Design a protein around this ligand. Structure first.
Ligand SMILES: [Mg+2]
Ligand SMILES: [Mg+2]
Ligand code: NA
Ligand code: NA
Lengths: 36, 432, 431
């Protein structure tokens, strides 16, 4: 199987208007710290 | 919060200076992912179509404005409002809209860039890294490993203008206990190899994959100077470091014969080349040989699998082109025992996961791979970890088109710790 | 208002296979920035200290665990709770806590990685790209340009093991109307140069900066094969494409004389080398020469600036090491007319902006630069755009340690359009 949790963010806390606002975030080389 | 609201394609530049496709996928909640398509040089004849423009007034004809327009127009429009978390559903929409078996309408470079950018955006929408999302897509949540890398530190064939016919000569740091330690060992051997080469007056400038591109007296001399660098760096060949090769033999298969141009056009039948390779595996701890014969030489590959398959990992690259239809026939015919996974050979993440799963189920190993033309993108690091493939091929320890993947592996291992073991030598088919 | 909550340093690998420092700055609310320090090979003697471990059992002595420990320990503790938007205050805390003139306690590589990661995190907290935040930090909001690139397509000196003593031979696509078109022009010339070189039986493997590293009959022959590639690519030398050089002459200055080892140890006085360079600019449209004399040869540079400065952009690199205290003396002594801006020569974004401003105020140009040891980081693209510097030096059109900066420039220009003009030739001092 595959597990199903309590889940996900409703709105990204770091919205980029375009991906070059943060290449690192958009390419997936650095991650937001959750929670908060 | 995961519906696609915007997709942008654009023409960027790859590590050889040629254009390729980049895509950004934006979701309603503000989540974003970005990815690029890599590009091969020794491309198999059955790879999905890399669509280029052919306009000689731009990039010597290598522009990708048509694929970029496919991303911005028909593809994006077909995906607006769809759920990015439904990766199989996103890829099916694009595959069906293109409507050709080899993705020749939009280009595999267009479809793949969107496929990968979508998976990254969905992962962000789920508040998790790509490798964790990939494990969930794969039906194996929380199952990770750090891959054992094979590192191409002497480049030949289509990747360098030297007299070396074999494409790639690689070291594998099987003795390391972490991928971070593996990366340091590879760097040290790579730097000692420079000193070994200089002392012989050989060239230390690098080819397409960041390995040295010297001229050699024979193809086998590459193994000798590498073994020599391993010893000078203080490691034990065969215990800490094993060796792997990518012949790309389709590139020197002429008129039913394998011809080593750098060795005075020395010619081999299929059987003769297999025994030439066998003798090398007795002189050196070569435990993996990729594309040791031509992509069409299935009878030859059957014989090579009888002679070497019980002791050597035999990796199909051009043989299988990351394509389940072809890998399936190879499994049923007892051809090889490993597959090189290049997602731009097939064109979507979903089809790539299918090839990895098909290999695992048959007991073949899967080696996640870059192309010779790369970008700063590091998606394959996340792919290798999130499918626990066990092995990765992503270049020498120089040029950031290679090292960006090693750096992403370092970050991932730092985040996962013991949840992503580095299993070492036993990942390799035939090793325990 | 945008408080730092966590700072992480780690040892990653640069484009040569050597360790360097990467830093992440995390803010409350989740904003994150990440950057890495580049590493020079031809390092000037007055550059801020790049701190390495010296442990011969790791990376042949080039590990950076001490610098990474500074990021994770003393630097992180000093910055938790501080406002990431106060870039000058953030940099001051790190600089003062280090307390040494050359940043030898923590390493300029530790401080720089945090400095840049912090600016990226602050930009995210403001919901804007780094180039836009940098322009606000600079006191010139909304003022942008796309830089004219000088592209190093034949590598020599310390960057390749060939017989070429001159470090860098560069093309500049001044005829382009956008940086996107400039990048294509450079790609086309770069690919035509490979054909030119193979037809002469010369090596087309690449050096540290992505340019070809052939052995040549003389240093000046690099200009000849580049001129052939420009023509074969269909462009007009001197109108579509001009030429630039980085001699890195501090690397071949021996016993008061400049010695070209690849040309049989041909020796020049400072005067003679200046006139050797002058003659090349009459044979070829060379409009920029970097480090044409040794970093200590200020008498020589004063003479070279009087002889060539009205006509040629003269770029101090090791001469100034991105250091306002040194640049200031140069301006007052009539030394050079341009500065190469390398933020790891000084170690912080705030000190880098000060060098750029001091150059512009004096009428010198500023050229934003990579180092020969790079990562996939593309911070200098945002820096050149966000300060409207006008020029960038970020390598040949191969290797993603160079091309990632070109790709970021393409993305930024797409986003900004006419708000970031490509001004072409007139960016270059003397044009
Ligand atoms: Mg291959
Ligand atoms: Mg320089
Ligand atoms: Na070759
Ligand atoms: Na040299």
């Amino acid at each position: 199987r595959r597990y199903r949790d309590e889940r996900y963010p409703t709105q990204s806390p770091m919205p980029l208007t375009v991906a070059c606002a943060s290449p690192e975030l958009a390419s997936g080389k650095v991650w937001i710290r959750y929670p908060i | 919060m995961s519906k696609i609201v915007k997709i942008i394609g654009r023409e960027i530049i790859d590590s050889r200076g040629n254009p390729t496709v980049e895509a950004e996928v934006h979701l309603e909640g503000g989540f974003v992912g970005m990815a690029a398509a890599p590009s091969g040089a020794s491309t198999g004849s059955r790879e999905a179509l890399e669509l280029r423009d052919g306009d000689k007034s731009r990039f010597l004809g290598k522009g990708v404005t048509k694929a970029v327009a496919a991303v911005n127009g028909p593809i994006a429009q077909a995906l607006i409002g769809k759920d990015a978390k439904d990766q199989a559903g996103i890829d099916k929409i694009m595959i069906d809209l293109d409507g050709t078996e080899n993705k020749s309408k939009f280009g595999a470079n267009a479809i793949l860039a969107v496929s990968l950018a979508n998976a990254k955006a969905a992962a962000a929408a789920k508040g998790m890294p790509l490798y964790e999302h990939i494990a969930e897509l794969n039906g194996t949540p929380g199952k990770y490993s750090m891959p054992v890398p094979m590192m191409n530190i002497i480049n030949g064939g289509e990747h360098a203008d030297n007299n070396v016919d074999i494409q790639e000569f690689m070291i594998q740091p099987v003795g390391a206990k972490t991928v971070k330690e593996a990366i340091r060992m590879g760097s040290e051997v790579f730097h000692h190899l420079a000193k070994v080469l200089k002392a012989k007056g050989m060239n230390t400038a690098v080819g397409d994959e960041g390995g040295y591109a010297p001229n050699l007296g024979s193809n086998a001399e590459a193994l000798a100077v590498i073994a020599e660098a391993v010893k000078a760096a203080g490691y034990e060949l065969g215990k800490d470091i094993t060796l792997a090769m990518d012949c790309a033999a389709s590139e020197f298969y002429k008129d039913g014969k394998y011809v080593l141009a750098g060795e005075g056009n020395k010619a081999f039948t299929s059987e003769e080349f297999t025994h030439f390779l066998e003798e090398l595996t007795k002189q050196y701890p070569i435990v993996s040989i990729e594309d040791g014969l031509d992509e069409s030489d299935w009878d030859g590959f059957a014989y090579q699998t009888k002679v070497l398959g019980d002791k050597i990992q035999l990796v199909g690259d051009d043989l299988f082109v990351t394509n389940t239809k072809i890998l399936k026939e190879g499994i049923e015919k007892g051809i090889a025992n490993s597959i090189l996974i290049k997602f731009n050979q097939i064109g979507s993440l979903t089809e790539t996961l299918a090839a990895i799963k098909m290999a695992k189920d048959a007991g073949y190993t899967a080696v996640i791979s870059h192309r010779s033309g790369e970008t700063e993108d590091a998606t394959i690091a996340d792919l290798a970890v999130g499918t626990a493939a066990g092995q990765i091929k992503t270049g020498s320890m120089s040029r950031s088109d290679r090292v960006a993947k090693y750096n992403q592996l370092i970050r991932i291992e730092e985040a996962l710790g013991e949840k992503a073991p580095y299993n070492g030598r036993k990942e390799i088919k035939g090793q325990a």
